[PDB]
Every structure is written in structure tokens, then in C-alpha cells.
Amino acid sequence: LNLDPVQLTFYAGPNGSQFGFSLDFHKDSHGRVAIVVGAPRTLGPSQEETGGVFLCPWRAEGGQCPSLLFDLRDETRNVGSQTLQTFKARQGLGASVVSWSDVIVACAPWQHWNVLEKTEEAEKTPVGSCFLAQPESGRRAEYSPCRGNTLSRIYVENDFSWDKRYCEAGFSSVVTQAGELVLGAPGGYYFLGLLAQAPVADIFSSYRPGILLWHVSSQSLSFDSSNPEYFDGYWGYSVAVGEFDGDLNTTEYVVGAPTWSWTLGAVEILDSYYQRLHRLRGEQMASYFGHSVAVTDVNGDGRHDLLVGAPLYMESRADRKLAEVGRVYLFLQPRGPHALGAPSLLLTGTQLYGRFGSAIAPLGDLDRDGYNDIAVAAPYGGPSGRGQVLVFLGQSEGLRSRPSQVLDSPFPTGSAFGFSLRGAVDIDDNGYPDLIVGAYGANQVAVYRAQPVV
Amino acid sequence: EVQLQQSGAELVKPGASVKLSCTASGFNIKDTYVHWVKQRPEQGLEWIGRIDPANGYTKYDPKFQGKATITADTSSNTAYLQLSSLTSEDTAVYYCVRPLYDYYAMDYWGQGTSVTVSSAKTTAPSVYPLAPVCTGSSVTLGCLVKGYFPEPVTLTWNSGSLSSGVHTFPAVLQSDLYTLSSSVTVTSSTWPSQSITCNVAHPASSTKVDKKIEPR
Amino acid sequence: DILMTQSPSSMSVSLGDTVSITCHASQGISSNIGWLQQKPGKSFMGLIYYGTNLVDGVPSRFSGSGSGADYSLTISSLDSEDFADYYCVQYAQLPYTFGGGTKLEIKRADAAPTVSIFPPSSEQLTSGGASVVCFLNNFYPKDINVKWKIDGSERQNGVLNSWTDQDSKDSTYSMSSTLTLTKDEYERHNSYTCEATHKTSTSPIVKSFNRNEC
Amino acid sequence: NICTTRGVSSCQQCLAVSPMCAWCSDEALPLGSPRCDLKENLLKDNCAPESIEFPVSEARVLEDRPLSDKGSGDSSQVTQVSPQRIALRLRPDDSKNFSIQVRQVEDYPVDIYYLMDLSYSMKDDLWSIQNLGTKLATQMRKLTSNLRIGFGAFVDKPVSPYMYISPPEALENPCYDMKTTCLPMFGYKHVLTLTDQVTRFNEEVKKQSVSRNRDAPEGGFDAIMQATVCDEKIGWRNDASHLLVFTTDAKTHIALDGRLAGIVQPNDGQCHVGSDNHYSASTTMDYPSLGLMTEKLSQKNINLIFAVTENVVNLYQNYSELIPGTTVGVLSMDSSNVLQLIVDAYGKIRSKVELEVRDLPEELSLSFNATCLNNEVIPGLKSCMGLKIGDTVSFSIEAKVRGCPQEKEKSFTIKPVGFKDSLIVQVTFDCDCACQAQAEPNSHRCNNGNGTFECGVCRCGPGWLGSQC
Amino acid sequence: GRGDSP
Ligand SMILES: *[C@@H]1O[C@H](CO)[C@@H](O[C@@H]2O[C@H](CO)[C@@H](O[C@@H]3O[C@H](CO[C@H]4O[C@H](CO)[C@@H](O)[C@H](O[C@H]5O[C@H](CO)[C@@H](O)[C@H](O)[C@@H]5O)[C@@H]4O)[C@@H](O)[C@H](O[C@H]4O[C@H](CO)[C@@H](O)[C@H](O)[C@@H]4O)[C@@H]3O)[C@H](O)[C@H]2NC(C)=O)[C@H](O)[C@H]1NC(C)=O
Ligand SMILES: [Ca+2]
Ligand SMILES: [Ca+2]
Ligand SMILES: [Ca+2]
Ligand SMILES: [Ca+2]
Ligand SMILES: [Mn+2]
Ligand SMILES: [Mn+2]
Ligand SMILES: [Mn+2]
Secondary structure: OOEOOOOOEEEEOOOOOOOOOEEEEEEOOOOOEEEEEEEOOOEOOOOOEOEEEEEEEOOOOOEOOOEEOOOOOOOEEEEOOEEEEEEOOOOOEOOEEEEEOOEEEEEEOOOEEEEEEOOEEOOOEOOOEEEEEEOOOOEEEEEOOOOOOOOHHHHHHOOOOOOOOOOOOOOEEEEOOOOEEEEEEOOHHHHOOEEEEEEHHHHHHHOOOOOOOEOOOOOEEOOOOOOHHHOOOOOOOEEEEEOOOOOOOOOEEEEEEOOHHHHOOEEEEEOOOOOEEEEEEOOOOOOOOOOEEEEEOOOOOOOOEEEEEEOOOEEEEOOOEEEEOOEEEEEOOOOOOOOOOOOOEEEEOOOOOOOOOOEEEEEEOOOOOOOOEEEEEEOOOOOOOOOEEEEEOEEOOEEOOOOOEEEEOOOOOOOOOOOEEEEEEOOOOOOOOEEEEEEHHHOEEEEEOEOOOO | OOEEEEOOOEEEOOOOOEEEEEEEEOOOHHHOOEEEEEEEOOOEEEEEEEEEOOOOEEEEOHHHEOOEEEEEEHHHOEEEEEEOOOOHHHOEEEEEEEOOOEOOOOOEEOOOEEEEEOOOOOEOOEEEEEOOOOOOOEEEEEEEEEEEEOOOOEEEEHHHOOOOOEEEOOOEEEOOEEEEEEEEEEEOOOOOOOOOEEEEEEHHHOEEEEEEOOOO | OOOEEEEOOEEEEOOOOOEEEEEEEOOOOOOOEEEEEEOOOOOEEEEEEOOOEEOOOOOOOEEEEEEOOEEEEEEOOOOHHHOOEEEEEEOOOOOOEEOOOEEEEEOOOOEOOEEEEEOOOHHHHHOOEEEEEEEEEEEEOOOOEEEEEEOOEEEOOOEEEEEOOOOOOOOOEEEEEEEEEEHHHHOOOOEEEEEEEOOOOOOOEEEEEEOOOO | OOOOOOOOOOHHHHHHHOOOOEEEOOOOOOOOOOOEEOHHHHHHOOOOHHHEEOOOOEEEEEEOOOOOOOOOOOHHHOOOEEOOEEEEEEOOOOEEEEEEEEEOOOOOOEEEEEEEEOOHHHOOHHHHHHHHHHHHHHHHOOOOOOEEEEEEEEOOOOOOOOOOOOOHHHHHOOOOOOOOOOOOOOOEEEEEEEEOOHHHHHHHHHOOOOOOOOEOOEOHHHHHHHHHHOHHHHOOOOOOEEEEEEEEOOOEOOOOHHHHHOOOOOOOOOOOEOOOOEEOOOOOOOOOOHHHHHHHHHHOOOEEEEEEOHHHHHHHHHHHHHOOOOEEEEOOOOOOOHHHHHHHHHHHHOOOEEEEEEOOOOOEEEEEEEEOOOOOEEEOOOEEOOOOOOOEEEEEEEEEEOOOOOOOEEEEEEEEOOOOOOEEEEEEEOOOOHHHHHOEEEEOOOHHHOEEEEOOEEEEOOOOOOOOO | OOEOOO
């Protein structure tokens, strides 16, 4: 409703870097808000694509941003008569970024790993990896929970059980308020998907450069399964956190598995032990239900509600035709330990191939009326297919059915405007929460400032 | 707190076998590699092998192949070292070890388990008094504790009232039996004018002998 | 197998000193080395892993360094608890292998041994045995050589030696040497001699006695 | 009646009242008599017959080639729809009906492009279809005398983690870690352009062999898209049924899966198969969505056939329901019945006739009565089923116009789904009177020049307001 | 298995 579409701020990264692929707000220890931007195809020293991270201070004018440097060299360790290898070429550093406290976590889901032993090997695979930074102090750490030292032959003997070689950890990520890093790894367990969790403090206190393989005793990973419903489900394609069990001492995880059950799609809500509390099933095969998930209380009852995006949902048209437009589902959390039940509201895109629901961002209370609001991206929507972001306001019964505001992409065709969104943070400190929108196709980020309601 | 609690001292006859235990406390044995190490005074430290209790896979130094066998029992949070066909070469202290962070490191150690190889039966010591030949401000007397098994023995002078000037030497195992000695030094006006006695106790045989040192 | 050569095998140093222990490997091990401590009569405590990283809880006065095949453990300002044995271990390759060890000892003033010789006791003789005991007490440094002589000729059979740890009080060392013969052979010789060679004296300390004679 | 109880001011306004109304422009008419009335009532008042305006809605056939009995010979001569063109005249709020005949002509040309999964899991099947070409020729020969067949194959996107990338040997031989040999991985490769020389199919297949990749779902949808939009490459003929036979034993990758290989660029639905016959955008472009596939299949008029093994039948039947017109057949274990499967599929495809309308003006609405089996009329239906090749059906169609559109001439098309031939309807909205062309502006008869004399009455000239200015 | 195999 009251975002300002007239006076925007633009940040930019290098050509071809995909600057804006991921982003988040970051508070330094002095309470000053900045923007962390992932750019997964940024060139490294080797002249090859490795990815990179940028830390943009707030400036109405925008502009270029200081790099946030991470070690981009391949590592080799000859230990225990084995050879451990990391490969950072095309690792996609910055394919996801998240901030917690004074720490930034930037992930490289396609970082590769191998282990050689004489003529045998583990196989060169994308275990993925996460880089952690404390910008003010300069401290650095890494977290790569899916790395192993088991040889290929052993996996064959066990029918490829507990196979974490293709995890792509950091594909998605989120941090709990208590500082527990949670990584989605959709390739985990031979493409079932898995989650990996570890306190940020313990990652920092256990990490030493050069080791590559070390124990994090407090870490916790989800489990393999022999239920074919889960096969190739990409459980962990998206993740979020919230409160869904009535115990405020505990954080619950929301996990998207967009291809669960032969591409039906699913989203699950679990406790921090990965015990399932709810399962939401997709409505239509191949719609990618679970591509994106968002948690926020939209109807002002103090209970977190769930939003699920299915960007490839095909709406029924006249003459028994189907039109791919994308769809978003709202599930209101009931009072008590009851089941979420059917969707309370269905929001459906209008532009063919627009991919409405690709990203869903809590905005907090944008218009300051007592109900939290959301923004929904359609990266290829709008009358000209350049991309649109639609704002929906909360209300006592959930969300409004019609958007209060529509932001048209200020970039050229193919920018993927809205692929990434982040709201709910007041960056200019004017008392209204603001919205940042990534457009990696144009290597830029756009900031929309909220203003007093006209 | 991470802690490796090993089993007690072992006394075993040549050719026999023995199984040592390493129980994890404050953590699960499946968490890391568990190694076994052998220590001797002269030859020093030697890596025997390791196991991954999670899957039972082992590695050995070929020197111990056929002699050492490492296993694990996750049900009881314990790892084992089996030594077979024992010789005097196997008399040593054995330690189990695990890493802290580094997968391959050797940071946390158990308190150690002593293995002593001997065919001897429990045997009480012969205690022999050692008086000087036949003269200075001080005189040194001695006590020879010979042919006993196993360790330990406790030796005092005058029920401990002689708290100073004593040297009790570490026991040495020679052909299945232990020998030990102790000297005491006092002023020449103290002995033989006064009584000085050797008190030797050997718990394993429940014996206690006193040998007064007499002039020759 | 990789050979770990640790130097020195022992060093006599003082409280508050700074000391470095080195370890040389037969081939490059790329920081894949650990350092261990063993206090007298105790078990092991880990000090360093992967070359330079202190194990959680280890005092800051400890530090590790090096690369390739050469590494060092350095203790800045020795504490009383630092007088112990230290070992290096490489895990670049199976089998893991250890250095020979380094023992830190307390430095003090040289001191010559007090040597006493004891012929066999009556009790032991009646039982057919004949042990001749020689005590070499409160000497420093620990390095010492003892030699038995029977009728002037060196004897090297039936000699059992035992050494005490550095004395907590005066920081000296002591040694016991026992020549065990049969009562039989004991009467086939006359003079029994215990000779001690130590840096405190150019000439050996000689203590003797003649059988029968008193 | 309603033609009089209005007091219309003009002939144009009279016709707009009702299709039943007529107008009398005769100057010699009783001053009391109404000019807008039924053609009869007007004549009763000695109204000059040549001065009465009364258009009548009609439907005139322009082209009407007879339906063909055979589809062989020259394709240009093949008529499956009749008539092919009609002129339709409608006056305000009126409606007129017309008919259309559709026939599934016998011996119509058929293109069959065979798209085969050659991943490792398909190892056993490749031997069964050793001579699918000739056998398929023998059977289809009964249904058509003009058959062309072609071949393509797919595995998956040759990129980690679908593809094994170590050791170096695995790239040239993905079966290296096993003690055997298979082809290097490929996305999609065109092998045999559609041809009537079936032995070319047999000999091409005999030289094919499987590859191997890591994950079970494969990249067949990339291949469906390319086989569809690479027209010249595959060789689809303008006048022939198009059968795209997709065979696999496993589930399939879908749009948005590509992100696990770091691929986020949406599929562009364009051809990317060059002279080397490989899909060149396999590693840079995401798998296509069902909607995009449907759009291209429809546009190129291609019938997709999912000939899959029993373990995934339900999966592909479910996809089939999301891609209207797609057919599913059960590939019995080892592709042993793929021949009959194809024959049966072709049967289902030509057992349906469904009409679709294109470019229908906003103000026109159509209603259909279908006559399918045994001349049994079915009201409100524009599609027949359970048909055989050679069967003819007809449809009664009524076009109704709501009002009088600004543009007096438009044309829309009625065509059976999948058919080449169509029926073009040229609509002409007859809303004006012939006498209006003879109107006299600034006529002395009307206010001495302040009005226009039209169809026997005075109309307010342009620029004036008020009924009588 | 759950991979590309017969
Ligand atoms: C392809 O698409 C098809 C159709 O959509 C999918 O099949 C459907 O799968 C879902 C999920 O497994 C099924 O939902 C379940 O329904 C049962 C009750 O169904 C019974 O009654 C139905 C209505 O009358 C009827 O359709 C069913 O008939 C089927 O089964 C019988 C017996 O085997 C068979 O004879 C028929 O031919 C049909 O096959 C049946 O009589 C219900 O009990 C289930 O509830 C459980 O699970 C849900 C969550 O899923 C949970 O919330 C509940 O608490 C409970 O635990 C469940 O809703 C649906 O019935 C199927 N439809 C049909 C017609 O088969 C199929 O999975 C897709 N395949 C692939 C590979 O994509
Ligand atoms: Ca909770
Ligand atoms: Ca709520
Ligand atoms: Ca609001
Ligand atoms: Ca603001
Ligand atoms: Mn198969
Ligand atoms: Mn595959
Ligand atoms: Mn396959």
C-alpha cells in the first residue's frame, strides 16, 4: 500500500555476477542496518566463476558495494593416507545469504568434494558448503556437514543408504533466534533431501582452516528414508522457522519438498528433532508446491501462519484449458494443537508463465494497522513479462484477496525481478518496515522505502 | 565431559589372551574414530590401530596383525582391544584415544591399562637386610625385597617414623619375578645405637615382614 | 612408515625459562602433527593438533609451529607443572607414528654420588643366593655409568639396575645396582667392586669389600 | 406490435428494434401511418414494395469441396471439413444457423518420431526393438500407405550431479567404476529424420547403445520440447498426423529441477539442435514446464504418446491429464508390445472429433448440436467420441449477434482440434438500410436546410442536439 | 535402487 515506487534506491554488482540472487538485512553491533547481497557467479582470482558476497551500507543513492571476502582457493589435505579435496569452481558462493546477530552466513551449494585413497575415491560431488563471517572482527569459519571420507565401494555395498555426497547444503538456509544455523540440502540422501543444524557459536569454536573434516558434536541432521514417497523430493529446497507447537521454548522448522511424492509437492512442519507435526500436500503435480515458504502471523492473533508458493500451478481456464500462472496458499494456525486443515485463502497469478509465488516475503506491518502483511513475487509477471511484486495486507480473517499495491520491475526483460525478496526491516529508520528486491538477471538490487499512509 | 574409562590392570600368563575395555563417558562411542596405543619405557609409543564404532571398520599397523584385534560394542558404549598369544614383549600400558575436532587427530586419552605377562603365581617377597661392610658422619643401610609377584609392595622404615633420607627404587621384573631395594641414610650416632627396621607389605599375598638391620 | 625424530631426548631447564622441542619427519607431513604431554606417573593430555591449534583448555604458554617435515613445540615461561614428557605424533599416513619423546628436567648444581656397597646377607646366603647391592645416591646430572668388577675384572652378567625419578626435594637422582650370583659362584671370587663414573669426578668412585675378610 | 410501439426516428433505429421489423421509406404514405412495422402491415397501407427496407439473415456457402474418401495421393486435394467457407449475414439481435461436416479420412499420412530413453536403466529394452521399424511398417501399412518414421534418444543434462564427473575415465565411460563400457552422457540427440525408408530405422537402432547417469529422474522433457520445435530437423510433414512416442522406465525431471545443477534460466521453447544433432542448451537451460510443452505441442499439432513401463504408468497418466490430448500406453516390461501400443494409441487419437473456435467476435455467440453415432442428435455439444477411421460426423451451429457491432465485417474460424482443414465463416452485419446511401444532407425538405432527408424522414444533421434540434 | 539402474 504505502511503499514508495517513485523514489527507489539501486545497488549494483559486476556484470554476469548474478548480484541480487539472494539478499538479507544485516545489523552491525551498533544497530546500523546494511544489506548483504549474494552474487553466485562473481569471478574469483582464478578468473573462473566462484560466487561472492557484498555488504552494502545504507545510502539513499545506492551504488557499488564493498566486497565481503572469503577464501576462494581449492584445498588439499593428505591425511590418514587419504587425500581430501575441495573444489570451489562454480560453487555458487552467495546462492543464499542470511544474517543473524553480528554474523553473516553465505552458502555455496555447488562446492564439490572428493576423497582419494590409492585407486579408489568417494566420487567428486556437490556436498555444498557454508561460509560464516563476523564482518566487524574479521573472523571467518566454514560449515560443510555433508563431507565424508567413505569410499564409493562402501555406498554400493549398503545400497547407497545415508548418502550425503550430493547434499548441496546451503541450497537454502535460515537461523533461529537462538542462533542455530539450519541448512536445507535438497540433494541429501540420494536426492531425498535433508536438513543440517548447528549452533553458530559451535561452528566458530570448532572450525580451524585446513582441517576440512572435523566434528561438530552439537550438530543435528535429519534422517534417510526408504519410503519412495520421499524419493527425489528435494526436501530442503526451501526452509523457514516459526512457532507451531505452543511451546515458546522450542523452534519449529518449515521445510519445502517441491517434488515430494512423484512431483505432487509437499511442505512439512517439524520440531527441532525432525519429528513431523504437519504435512501439507501439493494440489497439482509439477506445480512446485514448496518452492517457497514463509512464516508470519497475518491475522493478528499471535499465532504464526504459513504461506506456500507453487509458482508453476496451472489455473483452469475456459474450454478445459490450463494456464501456468502460479499460486500461493495461506494456512492459518488454529488455537490449540489442532491440524492446519484446508487452505484459508488461495492467491493465483494472472500472467502466463509469470511464476506468481516464486518468492514470498513477510513485510511485518507495512501500513501499521495491527496486521502483518506479505509481498509476493512474480518474476516474469506484469503486462510485459518483466516481473512484478504484489503486496497483500493482513486482516482479521487472514489476507486480503486483492493486492494493495503492485511494484512493476524497473529493470529490462529477463532481470528476474522478485526472484529474491526481503522485508520487515526499517532500513532508513523512519518507523516503517521496508522492502528489498533482487533482480539477479540485471545484477542489481532495488530498495523500496515505506512511507506514512497517503 | 568427554572421558575414556579403561578397564583395570591385567595379569596374564604367556600364551594366554586378554581383552581390554574402553568405555566412553559423556558422549557416544560412535561419535569418532577410537584408536589404541601401546607404551613401553624403552621402545616408547606405538600405534596399534583404530576402529570406527559406527560401522566396525578397522585399521592396523601390520606389526600387530594377528596379535591385536579391535572391536566395538555400541550397545554398551565401549571399544575393545584383544591381545592374543601373549609374550613378555606385550607387557606394556595400553591407551585408547579419540580426536577432539579433527577427524584424524589424537587428543583425548584414557587413563591407561597395564598388562603384565608372567607365568609366576602370587609369591611373597624374601626380605633381606643390608648392613654396611665394616666411619663418617652418616651411615647408609638397605633392604632387599626379592622374588615376589605381582606389584605392588609398600616399604617403610621404622613404621614410617623415618620420614627422611630414604630412597626406594622402582621394582624390576626379572624372569617372572620382581626385585626391589631401598636405602636409608642416618647419622652415625643413630645406628646401631638405635633400632632401624625394614617393613615390607605385599597385599596380593597378604604378607607383612619386618627385618631389623643388624651390624655384621 | 614415517619416522619421527624428536630432539632433544631430554633437557635440563629452569622455572620461567622458554624452551622449544623439535620433531623431524622422514618426509613432509604438511602440519598433520600433534603434540602430547605426559606428567610423571600420569596418562596423556593433548596439547596441539594439526600443527598449531591448542586443544581446548590448554594454557596459552604452549604453542606449536613448523611446516614440511620440521615442527616445534614451544613453552613460554615454564610452570612447575610443565616438567614432564612430551611426544609428537604424525597422522599424515597410516600407520600413525610417534617421536621418541622429550623429558624436561629441573636444572640444578652438579653433585657427586654417595656410593655404598653391601655384601649378601646371611639370610640370603643360607638360601643359596648371593646378591651384592650398590647404592649411588643424590647425584646430578642423571647421566651415570656403573661397573661391577670381580677380582679386578669387569662383570656384565646378573646385573639389575633401577633409577629413581628426579627427587622432588633436592632435584637429584639415585641409582640401585644389584649383582645377583649363586652362593656357589660367590665363593669362587674374593674382592667385589662397584665403580661409578660421573661428570663430577675425573676418576671413578670406587667402593669395594673382600669376601670373608671384615 | 413492438415495431410500432417505439416511435423510432430513423430506418436504422427501426431495424435495431427487432429482426421482425421493416421500414417504409415511401414518401407517399399516410401521415398517420407508421413507417416502422411488419412487412405485411406496411403493404396493407399501399406501401410501395420497392420502398420497403427489410433485410433477412442468411447463410450462403462459398466453398464446398466434397469430403475425401481417401487421404493418399496429393495432400493439397485432401478435404476433411465441408463446407470450407461460408458467408453469414446477420441483422441486429438476429441469429442464423448453418452446418459443418467433419470426417476422419481413411489412409491419411502419418509421421511417427520415436523418442527413446537410453539411460542405463533402459539397458534391457534396446535389444527388443532391434527391428521395430519393419514390424511397425507391416502393421501401420493397414491404417496408412504413407508412413514416415524417425528416431531420437535422451539421457539427462550432462552436468553434475546428474553426470558422474570422476575419475577422468568416467566422462568417456560412465560405466568405468563398473567393469563395463557405455556411451558418454548426452542430453538429447536427434538420430533419424522422419523417412519412409523403414530399414533406416532398423539399422540406426542397431547401432544405438545406452549411457549412464546418477539420478533416476531423466531429461526426456528437454527432448520432447526439441523434437516438437525443431521442425525442419525432425522432418514433420504439413499434411500428416504427428505421433511423438516417448518411452521411458522412470520418472522425469520437470521445470525448476535444473537448480540442483545450478541452472535457473527458464526454458525458451526455441530450437537448439544444430548440425551436430545434439541439444546444445542442455547444460544452460532449465527443463520445460508442462504448460510450455503443451503450448508447443498444440502449435506444431503433435500428439504426444507416453509409452512407459508399468512402474510409472500412473505417473504419466497423471501428467497426461495435465496435457490434454496426450495418450498413455503400457510398455510391457521390455518394450515387447511397443508396436501394438502405437497402433492402439493412433486409434484413440482418431476416435475423437472436437471443434474449436478462433477469433470469434465479442458480440457473437455460438451454440452447437452434435450428430455423432447413428444420426443421434446431442444438444449443446461440439465434440464426438468413439469414432473409427472413416466415420463422418456433422454439427448444427447457430450464430447469434447481440446488438450491432461497429465493424460491419468480421471472419472467424471453426476447426477440429488436430485437423489441418477448417471452416471460415465470413460474417457481414447488415444493420443499415439501402436508402441511407441516398440520404440528402442539408435538404430543403428539413427545416429549410437544418436537417438531413433520409429514408423518407427528417434527421437532425451533425452538430445538433435534441430529437427535433 | 533410487538411481539410474534396472
Ligand atoms: C495419480 O493421480 C491419482 C488420482 O489423483 C492419485 O491417486 C490418489 O492418491 C491419493 C493419495 O494416496 C488418494 O487419496 C486417499 O484417499 C483415500 C480414500 O480413497 C478411497 O475413496 C476414494 C473416494 O471414494 C476413492 O477414490 C479411492 O479409490 C481408490 O482406491 C481403491 C482401492 O485401492 C481403488 O479400487 C480405486 O480404483 C481407487 O484407486 C478409495 O476407495 C483416503 O483414505 C486417504 O486418506 C489418507 O491419506 C491422507 C493424505 O493423503 C490423509 O490426510 C488421511 O488422514 C488418510 O491418512 C487419501 O486421501 C486417492 O484416493 C487417489 N485417487 C485415486 C482415484 O486413486 C495417484 O496417487 C497419482 N499417482 C501418481 C504416481 O502420481
Ligand atoms: Ca515451539
Ligand atoms: Ca495467525
Ligand atoms: Ca498491515
Ligand atoms: Ca523505513
Ligand atoms: Mn529398465
Ligand atoms: Mn537422471
Ligand atoms: Mn534411467
